[PDB]
């Protein structure tokens, strides 16, 4: 309970035992912020909702669709090409 005490104050969840962070997620999309709907979502371990946040927002505004491909795959290997490329390809974004 001490950890949910910190989560309620931050705003991840609402007053109540709702384990899903959906209320935050669905309030953010209607607020117009798309990235904050992606960072939080896959911080809850949802990588098919991860693309969904960027896919849903991609109809408005527009590079995130290409990032949706990059943000899809990852190999978790020891010398996979994704890991070497991504650590460098991060710092060039705003």
Interface residues with a second copy (CB under 8 A)? Answer: 47-48, 51, 58, 62-63, 65-70, 72-75, 80-83, 85-86, 89, 92-93
Q: Find the shortest distance in angstroms from Cβ 45 to a second copy.
A: 14
User: Are the C-beta atoms of residues 32 and 4 closer than 8 Å to each other?
Assistant: no
Within 10 Å of residue 74's Cβ, how many Cβ atoms?
12
Nearer to a second copy, 48 or 78 (CB): 48
Distance CA 62, CA 84 (A): 25
Q: Find the shortest distance in angstroms from Cβ 55 to a second copy.
A: 8
Distance CA 48, CA 68 (A): 10
Q: Find the shortest distance in angstroms from Cβ 61 to a second copy.
A: 12
């Amino acid at each position: 309970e001490e950890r949910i005490l910190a989560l309620q104050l931050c705003g991840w969840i609402k007053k109540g035992t709702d384990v899903d962070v959906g209320p935050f997620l669905n309030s953010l999309v209607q607020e117009g912020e798309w990235e904050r709907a992606a960072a939080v979502a896959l911080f809850n371990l949802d990588i098919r909702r991860a693309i969904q946040i960027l896919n849903e927002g991609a109809s408005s505004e527009l590079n995130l669709n290409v990032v949706a491909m990059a943000l899809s795959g990852y190999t978790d290997e020891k010398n996979s090409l994704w890991r070497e490329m991504c650590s460098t390809l991060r710092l060039q974004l705003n």
